[PDB]
Structures are given as C-alpha cells and as structure tokens.
Amino acid sequence: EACGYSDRVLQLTLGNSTITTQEAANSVVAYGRWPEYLRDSEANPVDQPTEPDVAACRFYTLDTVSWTKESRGWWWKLPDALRDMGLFGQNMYYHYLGRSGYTVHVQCNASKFHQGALGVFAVPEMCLAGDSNTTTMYTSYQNANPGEKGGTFTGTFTPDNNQTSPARRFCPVDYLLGNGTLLGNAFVFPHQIINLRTNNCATLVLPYVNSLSIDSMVKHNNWGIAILPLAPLNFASESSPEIPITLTIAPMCCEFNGLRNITLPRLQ
Amino acid sequence: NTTTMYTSYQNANPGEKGGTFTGTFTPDNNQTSPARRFCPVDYLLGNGTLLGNAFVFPHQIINLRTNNCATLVLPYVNSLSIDSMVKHNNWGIAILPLAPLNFASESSPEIPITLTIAPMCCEFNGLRNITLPRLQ
Amino acid sequence: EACGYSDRVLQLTLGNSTITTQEAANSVVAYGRWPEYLRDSEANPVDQPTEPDVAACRFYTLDTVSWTKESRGWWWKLPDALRDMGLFGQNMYYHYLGRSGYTVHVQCNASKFHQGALGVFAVPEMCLAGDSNTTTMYTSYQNANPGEKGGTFTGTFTPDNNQTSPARRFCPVDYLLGNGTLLGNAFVFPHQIINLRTNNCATLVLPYVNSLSIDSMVKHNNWGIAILPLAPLNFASESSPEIPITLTIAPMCCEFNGLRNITLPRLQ
Amino acid sequence: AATSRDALPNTEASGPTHSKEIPALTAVETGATNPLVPSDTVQTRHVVQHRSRSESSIESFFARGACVTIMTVDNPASTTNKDKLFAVWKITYKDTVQLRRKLEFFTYSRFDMELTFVVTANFTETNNGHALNQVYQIMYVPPGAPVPEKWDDYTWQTSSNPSIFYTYGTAPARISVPYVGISNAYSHFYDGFSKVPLKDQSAALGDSLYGAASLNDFGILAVRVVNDHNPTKVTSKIRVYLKPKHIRVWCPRPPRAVAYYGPGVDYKDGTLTPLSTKDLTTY
Amino acid sequence: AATSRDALPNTEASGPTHSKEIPALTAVETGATNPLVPSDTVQTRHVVQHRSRSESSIESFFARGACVTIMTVDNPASTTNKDKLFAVWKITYKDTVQLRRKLEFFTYSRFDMELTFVVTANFTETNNGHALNQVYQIMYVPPGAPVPEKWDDYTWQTSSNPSIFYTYGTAPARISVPYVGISNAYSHFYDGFSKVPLKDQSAALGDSLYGAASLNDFGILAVRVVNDHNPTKVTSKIRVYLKPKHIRVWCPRPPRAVAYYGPGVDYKDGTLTPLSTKDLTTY
Amino acid sequence: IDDSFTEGGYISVFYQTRIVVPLSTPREMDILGFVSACNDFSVRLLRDTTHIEQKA
Amino acid sequence: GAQVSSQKVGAHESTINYTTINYYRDSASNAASKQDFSQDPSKFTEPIKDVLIKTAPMLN
Amino acid sequence: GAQVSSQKVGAHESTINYTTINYYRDSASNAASKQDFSQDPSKFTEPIKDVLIKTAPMLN
Amino acid sequence: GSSST
Amino acid sequence: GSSST
C-alpha cells in the first residue's frame, strides 16, 4: 500500500498481548482454515462448554532456546507446551475435554552478516519414534510430554541398551523428521522458513485438527511444532556463533467440556 | 484493647473453614506476640451492634420445625463497580442460633450444618501472573 | 505514493537555494502555524514595511560544529545567529523593528554502523541561566549574543568567582536545559530527534512568535535553537569518533519597520 | 411520584370476618415481615389520615450541622520558648460520636458537604495586656500537598489549595464541597485491607490495618492565627460543623449499641452491657 | 463546541487482530507523539465514559488567589526617633514561588487580575496601652507618578491614582484590574535586553540587565496606616493575594525544576540536584 | 501519592530474544523512554505541589 | 432563573409559595430542596422471590 | 440583563440552573464564567507537516 | 425566567 | 431581560 503497508511488517493482538514484527515473510493459515468454536451440528458432549476467551486466548512466551552450529533441531507438542500457561493450563487440567486452535510465532533475529535457515513446521498428530529396538511404542507419557522446554532432534539413532531400566524416551532423528519419513518432504505440512537474510520470524495460525470435534487434551497432542536448521547458522568467521530462538504461542477459540476436580498428572 | 484495627489479613480471612462467634469478649493480653484475630461477640453481632437488629440485613431463619434450609441470592454490592477480591470481602455470612438446639431429652445433641455457595455473573479484569497470598 | 514519494525524501526551495534530503523523519511546523506576514488587523507601526522577500528569505549555512563523545550540546538564538547573513542582516540592522519566521534545517549524517541521537529543540523566549551567584540577570549583551558560532551547554554548573572582572556569561547546564527545568520535558517545545540509525536531519518550520506583532530584533531573540545529545555518539569501537553537525536556516515572511541609519552594535 | 411530605394511607373501615383468609398467621423464616395494617386483625373505622413522613426522609434526618472536631491554635509572645501553635486535623466524621452513629445506620452514602466554622478566643495569663482582632487561615491540604511545618512557612501561600481567611467576631465561616469520593459512594464500612500480603514478601512488608483503605482518605485542615506574635498570649478554638446536604444512602445497618472504640468497629472490655435489668412479666 | 466539562471519549469494544496495520510501531524522531488508545494494542470492552477535564481547564487551574507579597507597616508613638513605617512594593508575581511556577508552565498570558488584601495587626511592646481601630490606605502608584517619601506627604491625596481605604477587622479588601500590559500578552520570559550597546557609546552607557524589559514594569503599591501616631506602637501586615481571572495562555514550557534564584531563570550552586536515588530494576 | 489502595501495578522491560550486532559495530546502546496520557485521561481536586518550595 | 415552589402550610393565620434563586455555578453550593421522594419498603420488608399475598398462607 | 445557565449536577438529592447579573461596567470586574472550551492537542502532539495515520508506518 | 413546582 | 445558556 501507498500509505506504507507491508507483508513484512505485522501486528498481532490477542487478549492483553500484542506482537509486532518488521521482518515477516507474510503469515500462514494452516490448510486455509482459521480457528473456530465447535458448531452445533458437529457438537458431541452436551454440557455447557467453558470458553475462557481473553483469559486463555493470549500470547504465552515459552523458555528461549539457543541456536548454534551444532544444533540439530527442536520440537514441542500442543497443547502440552502450554499446559502450565496461566488460565489456559488451568482450564485444561480442570476439564475432561478441551479443543483449541493456536497462533504460533517463532522469533529469531540476527544481522545482515549472519546466515542460516530454520524450517518451522506445524505437524498434525506428530508421532515421534522411540529410542528402543527391544520394545516398540514404549516412550513414556513423561518423556513424550516435556511441557514448555520441548525436546530435540538428533543426527544419530542410538538404541537404548539398558534393558533393566529403559530410558523410555524418543530418539527423533532429524533427516527422518523424527518419524521415519524424509525431512525434505516436511514442506507438505503447514510451514514457514526463517531464512536470516530475509525474515526474523515465522507465524503459523493453526485450526484445531483431529478425527474428533473435541478430545482429551491431557492424553492427546493435536499438533507438533518442529524447528530444524535447513541451512546451518553462520556468522562472519566466528567458529561458535549463537543466536536465540523464542517461541510465543496463543490459544485461539478454545473450549472445554466435562468439568470436575483438577487433573494432577505424573510428569516426572 | 491495646491496638484497634489490628486483625491480620490471615486471621480476617479463614477461607472455607470460616470463623466463630463467642458469648464472651476476652482481650488479648499478650503484648509481645499478639494473636491479631477477631473476637466477635454474638449478641453484638461481632461488630458492636445488637443482634436482634440483624434482621434489617437480608436473611432467613432455619427453624427446624418449619424448614431445613436457607437460600439467599446475593447481588454484587459495593461502593465501586469492581474491586480487588483478594483485598476486600463484599459480603459476610453470619449464622447464629437464635433458639438453641434441643432434642428429646438428650443432653448433647448434634446436627450438621452444610454451606453450599455458587458464584453468579462473575467477571474479572486486569489479568497478570497469579497472586500467591500469605495465608498462614 | 506508488510513484515513489516519501516522508524521508524531501526538497525545500527558498529564493535561490535548495536543500535536498533522502533521510528525513518528516518535518515539523511549530504549533501548526506556518509563517505569515503581519495582517492589517494586528498591525502596529504605521509606516510602509520593507519586505525583502528572496533577498533575505533564503537558506543561510552557519559554521559547522563537531559532535564527539564529550559533546554536551549547542545553542543558537534567532535572529541573532543570522545577524551577519547577507541582506537579511542588513535589513535587520537598518530598521528599528523587524519580524521573521524561519525554516531550520539541522544536518548530520553518519553510517549504518554509527549510533547516537540528537534532540533538536526550538524554544520560544529561550532565556538561559547565567554564570553568577553574586549577581542575577547579569549576562552581558555580547555574551548573550554569540552570532552564528552559537554557544554550548555544560554538564557542570561552575559559578564565576571573579568579582572584580566578572565573565558575565551564561552557564547553561544540559540536564536543566540551560534554564532550570528538566531536559526530559523539552519535548513540549517543537522538536525533532536526529537518531542516526533513522534520519540524518531535522527540519523545523518556525512562525514568528512573540507577545507583540513586531519588535526590536537587535534587542530581542524570539526563538532559541537547542541541540543536545540524548544518546551519545558511538562508532564501531573507536574511542574518539567525530561527526559534523551543520545548521542551515532560512528567514521566512520577514518584514521590517522604522528605517533609519544602520545599527552598529558593541559585539565584543 | 409519592413524596416525603404526602399524607400516609387512610384507615378504611372494616367489619367482622369469618373466613379462610389468614392475615394474622405467617412465617418469619422466609425472611419477610408480615405487611399487616389494623383492619387485618380488628374492626376499624374510616379515618382520613393527615400525618406524613416528611421529617424522616434521609435528607431531613441528616439536615443538621454536627460538630466533628475542635482545633486549637494560639498566638504567643515572640519571646516564648515554645513554638506558635498551629493546628493540623485529618478530616473525618469519626472523632466525635453523634453524626458518626447517624451515618452508620447505612453502609454507603453520597452527599455534598457543608462545613461551618465557629471560632472563639480567650486570654490565658492573668495579665492586663490586649490583643488586636485576629484573622485565621483555614487551609485545606489534600493528600499529597505539603503539610505546614511552621505557622509561617511557604505552604500558607495557598496558590492552589483552597483557604478561608476568617475574621474574628464575624459570622461563622462556611463553605461547600461536592461529593469528592474516589469511589461511586462513600464507604462507611470497608471489610478489607489496602494490601495483599504475599508469601514471597516479608510479613511486615505485606501488612496493613483491618478495614482501612486510603491512609490519607481526604487530607487535612491546617489552621493558624495570621497575626504576628503579640506580648499577651491568646488561645483560640475552631469548632468544625459538618452537614451532609443532597444525600443518598444504601444498605441499612443496626445502629452502634456499645461505645465507639477507635475508627473501626472495635469495642472495649467493660462497655459491652448496654441493656438494663427488667423482669419478663413486669410492665 | 467541545466544552471543558464534556465527558471524555467512550472506550469502544475491540477484538483480536492479525494485520499489516501497525499502531504500536512508531518513530518519535518525527517530533510527534503516537495518538494511541487502549483498543489499539489490547482487547477492550465498551465503556461509557463519564469523566471530564473540567477542573484542568486553564481557567480552573488558575482559579485560586495566591499570596504574592507581605507588606509591613506600623504606627509608632510620636516621640520615636525612628520614622513611621509605610510600605512600598514593586508589583510582581515573582517574590513568592507557587503562583510563579504555575504561570511559568507557559511563555505568555492574558488575564484580568483580582487582588485581595488580608490585613492583620499586633502590639509589640509589653505595654498595657491600647490603640483605636486602624484605617489603611493602599495606593497604586503607576510608573511615573510621585512615590511617597513620608507616611503623610502630599502624594497620599490620590487625585488620580486609585487608592483603597481599608478599615481593620472588616472583610478583606478586593479590587479587579483589566489586562493592562503594553504588549498583546504578558511575557513570562523575555529573551532579550532593553538596550542595544552601541560601539560608538561606552559599555556602561549601553548596558542593561538580561531578560529585563520595562525597569518599572507595573509600578508600586504604597501602604500606610492613616491614623496619627499613638502612644502604644502597633505593627501591621498586609498580605496580597493575586488571582488571574479570564485567562489565556500560550506556548507550554517545562516547569521550574530547581529552586528559584532571583527574578530571572538563574540558578544557585548546590540546588541543582532535584532527583533522588532509585535503582533501574527496582519497583 | 504512593497509596496501596490505589496502586497501579508494574511496568517492566525484558529481552525477548537478544540484541544482535555484526562485527565493526557497537555492542552496547541506549534506549530512551517516553510517557504520555491518552485522550481518556483526566485529573481533579487542585492542590499545591511538593515540587517547589521557598524555605525562608 | 427563579424557581417557585409551594410550601405545605401547617398553621394558618390559596397556595403559599416561596422563591429560590441559585447564586453559584456548582450544584454543591445549592441549598437542599427538601422535595424528596418516598419508596416502598419491600426490598427490605419483603425480599422474597415469590410475591407474598398476606391473606394466604406464607408457606404452601 | 440576567444570564441563566445550567449547573452540571454531580450528587443528586430536570435541569438545575443558576443566575448571574453583572453589576459593573468593566468586564474585568466580572466573575469567571467557567464556561470554557477544549481543543485538540495536535499543535503540540502532532506538529508534523504530513498528517499522521496511526495504523500506518510513521516513516515511509 | 421562572420555573414552578 | 434574560439570556439562557
């Protein structure tokens, strides 16, 4: 626009929170579907839903991670990454059922002299592969659900050989997208790339996706966020560059059914 | 009777257990480590006014021969439209035996009293991190 | 504009002089009033005014000063700073009375690797504080009127202790805006900031301001220009960076009354 | 449209009754008062009622100036060792008891406040010296403004604070003030604290008085004798009268039944037995 | 047509946003302040705003009498060696500080001036003699008119100067004066001199004070006790209060931040540190 | 004035990612901050300030 | 701007009236009119959800 | 020559008015009406030559 | 002019 | 007579 508006400069406001950016590469709406509340024709639990609106549909910033030349990649699951986030998390643990969409904003700035490219992928049902070749489908609830810290990818598969006290965790190999399929094809999932010369952020608007209208948020993650270095970090001629990556995520149109006492999960 | 308006936040706010009335005023004589709690005398409605007049406040009586419950629907009342719920209580519920419990000829009868309360039309403003009060 | 026009790119033309800029931060018109000639309903001296038009309403460039890490700030007074500028100055000294507006263009470029921010303030009646704690209101005409060289601010008040031959000059302390009020509030005066990453100039269009329609330009300054480093000059890792600051100022709609022989002031 | 000075309802004549209508029987458990009138339980005649409730309207009940404080000031000889006394009073209706008890029939109120000032002076030493007529300055110092530290310091300039210069022996001074509360009504009772004690903070740090809201609710009145020191000392008193005009009140309360003990609802041991002996079957 | 007592704008309810509109991002270099309202950066509800700016209109901000001076006079015994004291004051708002600071939020002003006079008297010697009620004469002597040299000389005739004869113990005296400036507005600041120093003239001859315009800007008030000498000496003080009515102001300025030091903008060494210690990351 | 009952809360600023610079660039810099009122802002009950005085 | 109202005449010696003019801009400066309204006590005397009919049983 | 204006009524007990008559020839003797106007802050808050649109970039 | 109640 | 505002 002749009044200055740009693809690269955006402002997002949800609840009492605002994000600004001056180096965006537009933003993505997964499968072209904006988040919505559950329609009566698709409804299933009959009790009056709780819809926290601004109390939960606001931007929550997770712990900042660090990108280096040896970084193989990071992953988070939703709603798991937000289970301890203010009133969203409370609403989640107090109800049997819950559904939610999300605005995911990945942040990573650097300088005109740095280079590198992060693939930011939102994957529906992001089932990851386990560390075991003695027992399949064995990753424990606690290890499958890291909360906000997330998990990481590895360049090497290493099988858990402790049979007496097994680690019971994922071993997500990066070129296999942590799930036995080639990473070069992950672009069929809703994505953006943070290529440092071009943009300093990724924004993905995710609808609630599932084979059900509503489900157990505590038992099941709907979306996975996978961030992998498609082109490695590099800067000037420093051997050990570092730049931070921050995730800020907002629940959208979230509603909950089946209110009771609060869930107190075994997380360690 | 050494310091007025001295009841601590912790003692003013018992949470769900509530507090009780007493038939006797007894002043806290520990000046070194004061109790800092209420001493609500029953015939003075715990506040220096006669209990027989408490009926000007919204009320019901549970008279056992007649009824087994009281139901009071309370509007939000205050000199402001909204306020700090953590700093300020809007309503007090006071339950006093106007006529003492009695049964057959037992000397020590007991019957339970249960309170069930529902918030209505509640709304909140000024969202931030959670308040973690000093309650003990 | 889709034909390329920008807030940042301006051309100003007055008389036989043109200024161009490619890194402006828009321009300011003090109190929203453009300069004007004196209207008949507000007129006071009855003699035919002299209105030099292009002979005086043109851009005059003053002596360039230098910004360094130890710079505390600079000041000029108008019309004083222009008293020796071509036919404007002549017209000024030949007439008892004169009034004028101004376009003030402060110039300071650097590089994408330098940083610093100059507050450029236009102050009506910029009375400055003196160096004395033995005699108030004692700054001499000669010291109050530096002409184009201007004066400077200081970080320290130091009282003139020579009682026998007093300096009789200003001692304008920077955080007190040289006048006993806090500099952080100087933004209520018409201003712009030259923040090196953003812009390389400030442009202020000043109306004639006074409690009279016309007055003695030789006795009285209407406006003061105060330039202070709000954020200090810095560059790469050099300890002693320097960049120049140039002032170019044009009188606007100036008119004079009360013609006689020329004023020959005691300036030293 | 029913006004405070309207006559109350007429008594309608009523005769004998024998029916299933039972006005006399009721059940106070419900929380209601039985709305009966004499014709419900006895035979009545027709009476045209002329009486009205005009004098017990909220306005009429409060339409009186009540003394809320007495401020003492003086003007001594210049030679005295003691400082010239000027007075400072924190504005309140709780230093005296009568208006306080009337307002406390209600939980909340709104009103415009009329303050009237009665000023009296006298001699103290068994002297024979005289004093010329005194002028007094009553300055309102709202929360935040500099409180005077000396009878003659810079604050008495009053460029922005409202002040009354009262001349002795003239009519008592009077001003009005609007409803100035920071809430939509004045709270006669505040069941709460001005601070939340946090766990992560020390107990001293989270502490505050029970039932107290703004520490300096309404500011202070500072009063002085403007005249310079005089050889003979004169002492004066300024009595302050408060009248609530244009008043509204909400949520009725039982009146104070035992002596006031502080600005809160606290009571003192030994004052808790208002009622006197009277036998159940004695008229 | 928007008046000072009109309610301010309502808050309009606003929802979530995801667009190229960037209200939050701005550039203060331009010299402008970003005109934002809460609905620009957070979700808002609809609120019907009732508050107004009525009390901060220029008129309301200045609508108070401020003390600008205290004049001392006396009336001694006829036998005294010292002359009867009459007072002479050069009219100004700069002898005190509070009204001065308020006016100096602005560069220029126009107003009608209301002057109110509070008069107090006392005895000085530890005598027992009395004095009958005093009448005071407050004479305005404009620049050029003969200033009184003695409490009783010919100038107190006042054929043309305005005078107030005030009777002690009566209501404080009061007069109004129009906007009397010789400019179109009063200048609170004059960056200039009243003389041009010429080269052909000596430096002493061309010299004048910085920031001073007419040496006798507005003239003086001369005050006396009209009563003849009395055996017992009485001393009186006349306090002068200035209120700017019907006021207009131009060109806002940062307020005075360090103590006033003279009628100009000068400051004194040792008074230049108004701000107190507070740590950057401490609430 | 400072008053617990009418307290306003907390303003604070944090690093969301970090400041990043290339080589040949200053590694430290300043930010400046400004405050102003919105169009819904008002004041009342005129009073004297403590920000000026006249001792003697 | 004069307001003319009637007095309720108690002891007698038409309608007798009296006049009122407000001298000040601020309504806070005004005297009290005493022209006040009455209301029904029901919010305190009958705060029950189901309307009470006094000839009927209060409990049914 | 009486001027009749309305009061903005704050606490309540139609439009309440008050009356004003000027007693003197000189307008300087008059009380202050307090019937004042407000203006937009723009000459101080937005003194820029090109009109500012707050949703747009301030610099383009 | 005159109001009448 | 009477003005009215």
Ligand SMILES: CCCCCCCCCCCCC/C=C\[C@H](O)[C@H](N)CO
């Ligand atoms: C020149 C004298 C001016 C005097 C100005 C007095 C202004 C202050 C008004 C105080 C209002 C007091 C009202 C009574 C108390 C409060 O109702 C309760 N404590 C609850 O808020």
Ligand SMILES: CCCCCCCCCCCCC/C=C\[C@H](O)[C@H](N)CO
């Ligand atoms: C019988 C008593 C009559 C008193 C008459 C007083 C007339 C003089 C009016 C003085 C006006 C003073 C206004 C204030 C000061 C000026 O604003 C500044 N110094 C700038 O001109």
Ligand SMILES: *C(=O)CCCCCCCCCCCCC
């Ligand atoms: C309405 O008021 C028009 C009639 C005016 C009647 C005479 C007014 C009497 C004097 C009032 C003086 C003004 C009070 C400030």
Ligand SMILES: *C(=O)CCCCCCCCCCCCC
């Ligand atoms: C306009 O003023 C016509 C109405 C007159 C009303 C009565 C005036 C009250 C007394 C004013 C006296 C004159 C003041 C010098």
